[PDB]
Amino acid sequence: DPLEVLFQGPEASMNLKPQTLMVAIQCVAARTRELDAQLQNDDPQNAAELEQLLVGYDLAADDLKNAYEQALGQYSGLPPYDRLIE
Amino acid sequence: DPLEVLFQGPEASMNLKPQTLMVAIQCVAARTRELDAQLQNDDPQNAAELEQLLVGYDLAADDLKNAYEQALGQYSGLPPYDRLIE
């Protein structure tokens, strides 16, 4: 993804259990939905910070999704991504 | 101890941006607090499922923390781990 590496740099190697990717995905989706509902009526300075944080949350969720899609090919018994976030 | 592996299996090789690990740590902590709070007002019916979900969330938080401790020795300018979960 061209513009993405430009803004955030490349993937890095790390070690995590597959379960941890599932948890990270649920919690990041959960927190994002909550914070989404908190934009409506903030003072302008605070809303800016919140918007800037959500940029980071959304990209992270994207990053975790890509990793999960690979994981769907390397393990057995993982729920489909769509079930994970719902 | 391990233990650990007996119960949760080994670490797997993953590719994620370092930011993504930071965002995941932050959201897992935030979300775990919120669910801890909900527990105080759950009947035992729902409580047991939620308790069992939290075992998972907590183990993943530990898994994420270990990865971050490694990260603190692989990259420059990372915040202290406590600033992520505050």
Task: Report the residue of chain B nearest A54, measured CA to CA.
Answer: B23
**Rounded (5°) CA angle B19-B59-A63:** 25
Conformation bin of residue A35: beta by default, left when phi > 0, alpha when psi is -120 to 50:
alpha
Closest CB from B9, B12, B27 relative to A28 = B27
Solved with? X-ray
Resolution of the PDB structure in angstroms: 2.3
| Domain topology for B1-86 | Helix Hairpins (1.10.287)
What region, left, alpha or beta, does residue A14 occupy, with left being phi > 0 and alpha being psi -120 to 50 degrees?
A: beta
Residue A56 CB burial class (10 angstroms; 0-12, 13-18, ≥19)? middle
Residue contact A28–B30, C-beta within 8 A: no
A20 vs B64: CB contact, 8 Å cut-off?
Answer: yes
- Contact state of A63 with B16 under an 8 Å Cβ cutoff: yes
Instruction: Identify any residues that bridge with B15 across adjacent strands, giving them in sequence order.
Output: A13
